[PDB]
Design an enzyme around this catalytic site. Structure first.
Site, mmCIF file in Angstrom:
data_model
loop_
_atom_site.group_PDB
_atom_site.id
_atom_site.type_symbol
_atom_site.label_atom_id
_atom_site.label_comp_id
_atom_site.label_asym_id
_atom_site.label_seq_id
_atom_site.Cartn_x
_atom_site.Cartn_y
_atom_site.Cartn_z
ATOM 1 N N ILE A 14 -4.795 -2.325 -8.190
ATOM 2 C CA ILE A 14 -5.435 -2.952 -7.038
ATOM 3 C C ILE A 14 -6.351 -1.935 -6.279
ATOM 4 C CG2 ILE A 14 -5.039 -4.454 -4.980
ATOM 5 C CD1 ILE A 14 -2.613 -5.487 -5.970
ATOM 6 N N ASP A 59 -0.586 9.675 -18.524
ATOM 7 C CA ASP A 59 -1.956 9.572 -19.030
ATOM 8 C C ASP A 59 -2.075 10.474 -20.261
ATOM 9 O OD1 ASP A 59 -3.027 8.039 -16.792
ATOM 10 O OD2 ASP A 59 -2.837 9.882 -15.615
ATOM 11 N N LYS A 69 -16.543 10.913 18.027
ATOM 12 C CA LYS A 69 -15.114 10.668 17.725
ATOM 13 C C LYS A 69 -14.258 11.875 18.003
ATOM 14 C CE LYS A 69 -16.037 6.676 14.899
ATOM 15 N NZ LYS A 69 -17.496 6.814 14.658
#
Ligand SMILES: [Cr+3]
Length: 325
Positions: free
Chosen positions: A97, A247, A63
């Site tokens: 998701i 959080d 690659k």
DNA sequence: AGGCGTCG
DNA sequence: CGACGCCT
């Protein structure tokens, strides 16, 4: 940056392997290679040269070869062109998701943010909220917006119970100008390792901040962890402060140190650190630093009295938070 | 690396 | 429970 184009390429290919083909080992390889190539001090001119490096083998050198010779990668231009792939990929951007849900929604014809808005019945609560503030959740938080949010947290926290100690970790304690969200470590003397736990300790703070109209939504909530949304004040003005991700974590009083180490560091830094720990024969946690015993068992936790204390156990130059990137 | 909370 | 998504 000496080899930005090769790294960007491997990272793009990594995401594709995680989000679309769900091939975890490839994802890992591309990530490890990118990280190894970005630390290489010369400008790479062949895949053959790159292959000499650890983590880069044949499939990655091929690659890199094709990329150097032609200025691009055919595999990737085709990935960028495949609609199921880009859709599966984009939906993963919604908090809640992941690869699975993304591949189920696309499999059912849902691809757009708009389609999603016509199909909240397919989305669980976390995903509906993540869909709700998708755009705001993309926006980064300026350190100034952060310092304001911190005062609101610390101030309310004591009003409830002055024995409460709140610390905003994450990229803030690391000295950053902007952060993705607000990460706040929480401690209270009632919550301790030798106590019969205490869920009411985090709920109180959350409900409190909820009442001042600070915490707006909740994605998830429990004894030790809160994951939700918060927002700063505005009176009669357009473009109120964007909704932010927050959080909160309740760690035991007598384990605050492992807690700041974990909720601070960096997902990368912590990984590299918990790797050393095992090398030396120890097990770093967000709770404890118990040592590795026999062929596969960790025992009683060593006592720490500073983050410094944790590092010295695995023999390291105290990494000042701002260095933990 | 290590683990918390949600889902069904 | 496992699998998933998320946290650093
Ligand atoms: Cr954060």
């Amino acid at each position: 940056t000496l080899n930005g184009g090769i790294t960007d390429m491997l990272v793009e290919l990594a995401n594709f392997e995680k989000n679309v083909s769900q091939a975890i080992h490839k994802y890992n390889a591309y990530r490890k290679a990118a990280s190894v190539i970005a630390k290489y001090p010369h400008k790479i001119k062949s895949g053959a040269e790159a292959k000499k490096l650890p983590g880069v083998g044949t499939k990655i050198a091929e690659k890199i070869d094709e990329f150097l010779a032609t200025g691009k990668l055919r595999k990737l231009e085709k990935i960028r062109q495949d609609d199921t792939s880009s859709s599966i990929n984009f939906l993963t951007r919604v908090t809640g998701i992941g690869p699975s849900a993304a591949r189920k929604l696309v499999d059912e014809g849902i691809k757009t943010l708009e389609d999603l808005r016509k199909n909240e019945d397919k989305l669980n609560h976390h995903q509906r909220i993540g869909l709700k503030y998708f755009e705001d959740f993309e926006k980064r938080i300026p350190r100034e917006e952060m310092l304001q949010m911190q005062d609101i947290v610390l101030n309310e926290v004591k009003k409830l119970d002055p024995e409460y100690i709140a610390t905003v970790c994450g990229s803030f304690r690391r000295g950053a100008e902007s952060s993705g969200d607000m990460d706040v470590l929480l401690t209270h003397p009632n919550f301790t390792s030798e106590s019969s736990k205490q869920p009411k300790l985090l709920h109180r703070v959350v409900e409190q901040l909820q009442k001042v109209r600070f915490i707006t939504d909740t994605l998830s909530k429990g004894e030790t962890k809160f994951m939700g949304v918060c927002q700063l004040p505005s009176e009669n003005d357009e473009n109120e402060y964007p909704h932010r991700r927050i959080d909160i974590r309740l760690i035991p009083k007598d384990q605050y140190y492992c807690g700041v180490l974990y909720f601070t560091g960096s997902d990368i830094f912590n990984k590299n650190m918990r790797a050393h720990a095992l090398e030396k024969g120890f097990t770093i946690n967000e709770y404890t630093i118990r040592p590795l015993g026999v062929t596969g068992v960790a025992g009683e936790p060593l006592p720490v009295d500073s983050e410094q204390d944790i590092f010295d156990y695995i023999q390291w130059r105290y990494r000042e938070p701002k260095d933990r990137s």
